[PDB]
């Protein structure tokens, strides 16, 4: 797996590959690892597919459960701490092989400056978190390759499109070096999923946009 | 890894992928797994890269050694036996992780019928061997996918050229389902290597031919 | 074991073999592994016979329990989640050898287009699941042979007849390469079972239809 | 695997299946497990394919080696002893998975009575051996089914052809109950192999003959 | 450790950091890991400091010993094989913690195509080797970061100067993300080792030149 | 990690590096390991990032919980006992890798002398504690280097400013000899955090001041 | 143990403590850890006493053996290599508790600058070595205290006498923080040993001078 997230002016983008493996064997081509967890939050999870999807579903339900009970959504800090509590709670099963490493992207409607209201929170397996200040982050087996790619491309991000393209290209590099991260499948038309989030909320990115970017990156590296 | 070999009327063909891994990490893109071991035999080996290459080089040396000492090459049976002995002798290292699983494709200059002089010999890790009589064989992490593909595609083998297209297609199905087997890389121009052996000897198939078959396969799958 | 499921225009088909083993010894010849679990759902389980049959039985009971208590059946998404929760809850026992891997086929009377209302859901030993979008899937010790067979035969599926044929022939290839999958027994008159589901519901394919399909396949492969 | 051997009046027969497995996976359909190791002797071996075949080859080479050196072939007792020693030598390796379990069938040209010149000798993994006096024997994962089938079928053996048929039928029952033992494959045309030995020596039974016997058995059970 | 090597028109460059650790403790600041092993060859080794140094020394002696014994240096192929045999020979010790993972750069005075006589050979711990064809490679705990850095920077290599700049910048990225790799030390005036090889031989890059490259990279990233 | 604390006339200072690692790999550059845990108290924590931060958070909530329930803040001794009990409660987890090892710097508003009222308390992983009488202390993988530095530089501490200088230079030496301790990052502009506590309470030290001191030490060494 | 070595203008000095322990128990008070191995070379070894002493003895015999065989002494490099090889040879024993970690000081009579002819080489348990370029080094359980002490004191080293003072004071700090390093015993009159090496060769430092410097350090810290 590789999930990436990066801040662009007035928003965040998160994107994730579509591969599922069992050892060397490809068990999935179309898995979704990035979920809109609320109107201003998307979560992307690496590790054991079953636990990862379960984390995403549970998290979204907890957030909305608080919203309906108390009349108001959690503060972003609260959302961070609830995800962190979930990860810590899973530490023992993680060490037994039921792993879930999340990566949180969101838009803080209570931030002062909308330009930097985007938030990228990374986590370790003990529940430790860090709000990232350098613009991008990644999780999963290809996360190193993706992070080193964004280290070189991130300065190209000036809007939603350039950010979405840098994310997709970072996933392209990850799949190029990590066999457990799926690259774009142009025979099948399967492409990484991506969620973008700004003041108008969190939306899924149309498959055709990501398809187009993938093709441009491929051609760019061919000739 | 996936190595495939198959008989066609008058000859035999063996093709191998190009990928190297260390866990999920892709460590090589252009490794070679099929070697012309003598004028009428090619050997393709799956397993630890160092041990595979060493096997091919030593086997080829031993065959030519016998040839120059005795004024004649070994019978095809003898060549089988020397490979089987090499494998058996490596069994204990294989048990500790230094594995070499070979696959033998050759042409028997002493067979009565030159159209059925092609030989495909598979091996197990204990040095057992079987002269494959159903037309095709594969070894490596992707070999069950490649076998099951060739099972359906083998009626298309009517000469060396459709044999080569079927070998390349089997390797394509293998890369489709096994992340330790590398598919054709159209960005970089790296394709499986292939050897074709007939009455005139064993010769390497040029890259551009395999590339052409690969693009035909991809453009067929892609509708 | 091999259980296969595949979609055809307007519905879905699931079929399973009849063999039971304890090691190399054949302990059963007519066991049933594919059950109609409700009017529009069939479940096919691989693993330990006792746990597989128990899963089918308890799952069907659970679904009907819901429908009687609330006056309406679970959504298809509900059904998926309930099965997944069963598998997950059985994990530890599975790690101790009491394994039960289901494969779920169904027709969703609440889908938009009843011609793509077919559903194929595969699972892993954790609760993890995936809705198959490529038209076929298989579970059990023959699932790789069967899926690779279907990868080559699926283009022939244009209706339930060709769907049932491709399913029975995938089970034939499976039995052909996997000794723990039983092929058609022409001496005893024992054949894989099948369920077909379309907008009229789920129905057991009568044994004689499977028999003549099996005979056709065999004669195909003899000449 | 299943290897069977039985005595008929004036000779012996041995037949073996053709299946090779790795766990549940069928890895071979045409392996040969019964070999003519000399003009009056056949060995059939169960276990690890490479070791089975290596044993047959080295055993035949060894016997013929004695024959060329000393100008005369080993007594039947000496052949038994050489096989038994070869099996005992493999014990450590066999405990690690490189198992070879032989079954010997021969005709003793120095026996007293040609009617009782047939020999069937069974072995265990320690090299212990026994000369079968009850008419038949078998070795491999299917051997119990083959032997319980022969126990009921042996009274039909009255000549070479009925003994061959009983052997093929025993192997058929073995395959019916043991998945590591391959039955007749009518689609591909692969059948058990068989050697028959009498006063004129050991020969390979032709594949057609076994095919007919198998088709007869199948039809009879349908 | 991080060692990088890359090709440029007419030559090759290799460079390595200066750091030695014992767990988290810094135990050396001026260590040297890149050695001119003969007039046209340099070796950079990661792993246990004592093994790596010993490997370099012994390998140099081996090459020159052949050269004096036979009146002629080994082919480049033979130098590869000899290093590989040395590594294989060290496998068991490597598994007990006495690792030496070499990287080979050279200039082949007998190159078929005198245009591309530069050579870069990588090695795994079993003695497997591969002649890099994509222009660069790295070895050591920082090697993934250097390889992704160079993946982004390699197009800027058009001569020995730019090639040396990209090498040192890859080292800088490596130390940026790997505490086991030492960055430049402007306080003590300690910088990475480098060697550059072309048709006129192999030469140690003066420290001052690496100092200027380090200062250019640092100012580039300060603003 | 290195956390340092040292007493100066009328106060105390605590300062911590910004590095997080997983093995050799740098996983964070800007983490905060030093926390104002109440108006007169800071805690620096070495160990597992998640457990460390959790300790600081829980501890601050606990001290204020007492204060709001009882109308008055815990004595300094009680504050120590509550941290120590927390550490002891975590010993089982700490043996399995989830380690939090704290260092307490406070100002005791109840002490006799408002110039020697600064308090530095060190802890061990069982919750044992000691009130440091020799003026300075440190914790974390770099704590030995930091302490051997302050041993030499502590005579230069005459006020809050010089004490902060010695604290940042101790952190510098720690970074020089321990790769799990981050040194000043002039390119990115990340510097150790520091808190100073005196009679006026605990206050965060402005980054720009720590940056100044770091540049002065860096220049001094070259 | 703590063994220190540092360069002064035109020479080098090496000093070591006198303590031998078994667990917590003091088992020796006057052990010598620093040995003149030849006219221009001194070696000090931490680790297992028996092995350390055996290493120093056999090493001196090795160097003198080469000198009498070849009519000339080894180059400084050669002496290094011989020690490194000896250390690598003991690696397995060391891994099982029979450890020998040496520190090497010398004056290279074949050096270019007579003032840059001092030489300090450190080693790891695998036979890795490094020629130290920053002026000082130390080995033993107290070598981090000793090296951090010398990091701060090395500026005061301007001649051989000041260098000796820094060596002894570094050892003193080592003893202050490491119970396996023995500080000056004024009651018994046992003090560290010290070799000085310059162009005129290597010499034992008289005990009276080290005792003098020791009491100066002690009185200085009260
Ligand atoms: C005890 C156990 C482990 C497994 C296992 O390996 N399960 C695989 C997943 C898998 O084979 N599947 C096919 C069948 C239907 C469900 C699913 C899609 C996995 O989890 N593999 C890991 C290595 C993986 O690929 N994880 C990627 C991933 C991450 C987040 C996410 F949401 C989905 C994902 F696939 N199963 O049981
Ligand atoms: C202890 C240890 C393990 C390994 C290891 O996994 N070594 C890899 C090989 C590797 O990482 N390499 C890049 C650097 C240079 C040489 C080579 C190309 C391997 O053997 N991996 C296996 C899984 C593999 O991919 N095998 C495929 C293969 C088959 C035949 C062949 F000739 C070459 C191949 F790469 N090495 O040391
Ligand atoms: C703890 C334990 C397990 C077993 C065991 O392996 N029990 C076998 C089943 C068996 O010997 N039996 C005959 C008598 C009774 C009924 C049944 C039919 C099995 O579970 N074998 C597994 C490997 C198997 O063959 N599974 C195929 C299968 C799948 C789904 C299903 F519904 C039924 C099936 F037989 N025995 O004890
Ligand atoms: C350590 C090890 C074991 C094995 C293994 O299981 N090897 C299988 C054999 C196999 O997969 N093969 C195909 C490829 C080449 C040769 C052979 C034909 C086996 O030995 N299986 C055993 C259980 C078996 O099936 N034995 C039947 C048998 C008996 C005698 C004989 F001569 C030949 C046979 F196949 N391989 O390495
Ligand atoms: C690794 C292994 C185990 C065995 C094993 O248990 N071998 C059995 C003997 C056996 O199955 N056989 C038939 C096939 C040919 C030879 C022999 C006749 C045994 O040794 N069983 C023991 C428990 C036994 O019965 N011992 C009785 C005995 C004592 C003395 C003697 F001379 C002969 C005997 F059979 N053999 O190899
Ligand atoms: C059995 C054993 C291993 C070690 C150990 O970890 N020894 C360290 C090296 C060390 O502490 N040293 C200082 C004193 C002498 C010289 C040397 C420089 C190491 O090998 N560390 C590894 C992790 C390392 O940093 N390796 C980097 C490296 C690579 C190539 C090279 F040539 C030199 C290097 F230091 N010690 O004992
Ligand atoms: C069981 C387990 C351990 C770990 C682990 O090693 N976790 C690392 C921390 C890490 O990789 N992270 C990035 C993303 C999330 C948040 C955090 C910042 C750690 O704890 N490393 C230790 C060695 C460490 O660096 N501790 C330093 C430290 C001390 C106090 C503090 F408050 C914060 C700190 F980072 N993960 O799971
Ligand atoms: C089972 C066993 C224990 C030991 C052991 O610990 N042996 C001690 C030495 C000791 O107890 N002794 C008194 C009796 C006479 C010999 C000596 C003086 C040691 O080696 N302890 C280590 C920890 C130590 O203190 N080493 C200091 C040292 C270093 C170098 C040197 F040359 C001399 C030294 F004493 N050896 O074997």
Coordinates of C-alpha atoms in Angstrom, one line a residue, chain E residues 19-213:
Chain E
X19 CA 29.6 8.4 9.8
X20 CA 30.2 5.4 12.2
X21 CA 27.6 4.5 14.8
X22 CA 27.1 1.9 17.6
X23 CA 23.4 1.9 18.1
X24 CA 22.4 5.5 18.5
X25 CA 25.9 6.6 19.5
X26 CA 28.1 8.3 17.0
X27 CA 31.4 6.5 17.1
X28 CA 33.2 8.0 14.0
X29 CA 33.0 11.3 12.1
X30 CA 35.8 10.9 9.5
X31 CA 35.4 7.3 8.5
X32 CA 36.2 6.5 4.8
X33 CA 34.0 4.0 2.9
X34 CA 34.9 4.6 -0.7
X35 CA 38.2 3.3 -2.0
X36 CA 40.1 3.4 -5.3
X37 CA 40.6 -0.3 -5.7
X38 CA 42.5 0.0 -9.0
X39 CA 43.5 2.6 -11.6
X40 CA 40.0 2.2 -13.1
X41 CA 37.8 0.9 -10.2
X42 CA 36.5 2.1 -6.9
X43 CA 34.6 0.2 -4.3
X44 CA 32.2 1.6 -1.6
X45 CA 31.1 -0.8 1.1
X46 CA 28.4 -0.6 3.7
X47 CA 28.0 -2.7 6.8
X48 CA 30.3 -3.5 9.7
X49 CA 33.1 -1.0 9.6
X50 CA 35.9 -3.6 10.1
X51 CA 34.5 -6.1 7.5
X52 CA 34.0 -3.3 4.9
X53 CA 37.5 -1.9 5.2
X54 CA 39.0 -5.4 5.2
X55 CA 37.0 -6.3 2.0
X56 CA 38.2 -3.2 0.2
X57 CA 41.8 -3.8 1.1
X58 CA 41.7 -7.5 0.3
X59 CA 40.0 -6.9 -3.0
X60 CA 42.5 -4.3 -4.1
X61 CA 45.3 -6.7 -3.3
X62 CA 43.5 -9.5 -5.2
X63 CA 43.2 -7.4 -8.4
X64 CA 46.8 -6.2 -8.3
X65 CA 48.0 -9.8 -7.5
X66 CA 46.4 -11.1 -10.6
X67 CA 47.8 -8.2 -12.6
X68 CA 51.3 -8.9 -11.6
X69 CA 51.0 -12.7 -11.9
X70 CA 49.6 -12.7 -15.4
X71 CA 51.0 -9.5 -16.9
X72 CA 47.5 -8.1 -17.5
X73 CA 44.6 -6.9 -15.4
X74 CA 41.4 -8.9 -15.1
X75 CA 38.5 -8.0 -17.4
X76 CA 35.8 -6.0 -15.7
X77 CA 33.7 -9.1 -15.7
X78 CA 36.4 -10.9 -13.7
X79 CA 36.6 -8.1 -11.2
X80 CA 32.8 -8.4 -10.7
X81 CA 33.0 -12.2 -10.2
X82 CA 35.9 -11.9 -7.7
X83 CA 34.0 -9.4 -5.6
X84 CA 30.9 -11.5 -5.8
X85 CA 32.8 -14.6 -4.6
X86 CA 34.2 -12.6 -1.7
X87 CA 30.7 -11.6 -0.7
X88 CA 29.2 -15.1 -1.0
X89 CA 32.2 -16.3 1.0
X90 CA 31.2 -13.9 3.8
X91 CA 27.5 -14.9 3.8
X92 CA 27.5 -16.9 7.1
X93 CA 29.4 -14.2 9.0
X94 CA 27.1 -11.6 7.5
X95 CA 24.1 -13.4 9.0
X96 CA 26.0 -13.3 12.3
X97 CA 26.3 -9.6 12.0
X98 CA 29.7 -9.1 10.2
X99 CA 28.1 -7.7 7.0
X100 CA 29.9 -6.1 4.1
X101 CA 27.6 -4.9 1.2
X102 CA 29.8 -3.6 -1.7
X103 CA 29.0 -1.2 -4.5
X104 CA 31.3 -1.2 -7.6
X105 CA 32.1 1.6 -10.0
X106 CA 34.6 1.6 -12.8
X107 CA 35.6 2.5 -16.3
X108 CA 36.1 -0.4 -18.7
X109 CA 39.1 0.4 -20.9
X110 CA 38.0 -2.6 -23.1
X111 CA 34.4 -1.5 -23.4
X112 CA 32.8 -2.5 -26.6
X113 CA 31.2 0.9 -27.0
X114 CA 33.9 3.4 -25.8
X115 CA 31.1 5.9 -25.6
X116 CA 29.7 4.2 -22.5
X117 CA 32.7 2.7 -20.7
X118 CA 31.4 3.7 -17.3
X119 CA 30.2 0.8 -15.1
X120 CA 28.1 0.6 -12.0
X121 CA 27.6 -2.9 -10.4
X122 CA 25.4 -3.6 -7.3
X123 CA 25.6 -6.6 -5.0
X124 CA 23.3 -8.4 -2.5
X125 CA 24.6 -10.3 0.5
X126 CA 24.5 -13.6 -1.3
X127 CA 27.0 -12.5 -4.0
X128 CA 24.3 -11.7 -6.6
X129 CA 25.3 -8.8 -8.8
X130 CA 23.8 -6.7 -11.5
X131 CA 25.2 -4.2 -13.9
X132 CA 23.1 -1.1 -13.5
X133 CA 21.7 0.3 -16.7
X134 CA 19.7 3.3 -15.5
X135 CA 22.6 5.6 -14.5
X136 CA 22.9 5.5 -10.7
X137 CA 22.7 3.2 -7.7
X138 CA 23.3 3.3 -4.0
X139 CA 24.0 1.0 -1.0
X140 CA 23.5 1.3 2.7
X141 CA 20.8 2.3 5.2
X142 CA 20.3 5.6 3.3
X143 CA 20.3 4.0 -0.1
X144 CA 16.5 4.3 -0.7
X145 CA 16.5 8.0 0.0
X146 CA 19.6 8.6 -2.3
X147 CA 18.0 6.5 -5.0
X148 CA 14.7 8.5 -4.9
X149 CA 16.7 11.7 -4.7
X150 CA 18.7 10.7 -7.8
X151 CA 15.5 9.5 -9.5
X152 CA 14.4 13.1 -9.4
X153 CA 17.8 14.8 -10.0
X154 CA 19.5 12.5 -12.6
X155 CA 18.4 14.4 -15.6
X156 CA 20.6 17.3 -14.5
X157 CA 23.7 15.2 -15.0
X158 CA 25.6 16.3 -18.2
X159 CA 29.2 16.3 -17.1
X160 CA 31.5 15.4 -14.2
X161 CA 30.6 18.5 -12.3
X162 CA 26.8 18.1 -12.3
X163 CA 27.3 14.4 -11.8
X164 CA 29.4 15.0 -8.6
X165 CA 26.8 17.6 -7.5
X166 CA 23.9 15.1 -7.8
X167 CA 25.9 12.5 -6.0
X168 CA 26.7 14.8 -3.1
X169 CA 23.0 16.0 -3.0
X170 CA 21.8 12.4 -2.9
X171 CA 24.1 11.9 0.1
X172 CA 22.7 15.1 1.7
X173 CA 19.1 13.8 1.3
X174 CA 20.2 10.4 2.7
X175 CA 21.6 12.0 5.8
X176 CA 18.6 14.2 6.0
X177 CA 16.4 11.1 6.5
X178 CA 18.8 8.5 7.9
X179 CA 20.5 9.2 11.2
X180 CA 23.0 6.4 10.4
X181 CA 24.3 8.5 7.5
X182 CA 26.4 11.6 8.3
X183 CA 25.7 14.9 6.6
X184 CA 28.3 17.5 5.9
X185 CA 29.9 18.9 9.0
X186 CA 30.7 22.6 8.3
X187 CA 31.8 23.1 11.9
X188 CA 34.7 20.5 11.6
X189 CA 35.2 20.7 7.9
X190 CA 34.4 17.0 7.3
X191 CA 32.6 16.2 4.0
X192 CA 31.7 13.0 2.1
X193 CA 34.3 11.0 0.2
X194 CA 34.2 10.9 -3.5
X195 CA 36.1 9.3 -6.4
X196 CA 35.7 10.1 -10.1
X197 CA 36.8 7.8 -12.9
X198 CA 37.1 8.4 -16.6
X199 CA 39.4 7.3 -19.5
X200 CA 42.3 9.0 -17.7
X201 CA 41.9 6.9 -14.6
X202 CA 40.4 7.1 -11.1
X203 CA 41.1 10.1 -8.8
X204 CA 40.1 11.2 -5.3
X205 CA 37.9 14.3 -5.4
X206 CA 39.6 16.9 -3.2
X207 CA 37.7 17.7 0.0
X208 CA 37.4 21.4 -0.8
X209 CA 35.4 20.6 -3.9
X210 CA 32.9 18.6 -1.8
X211 CA 32.8 21.5 0.6
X212 CA 31.8 23.8 -2.2
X213 CA 29.1 21.4 -3.3

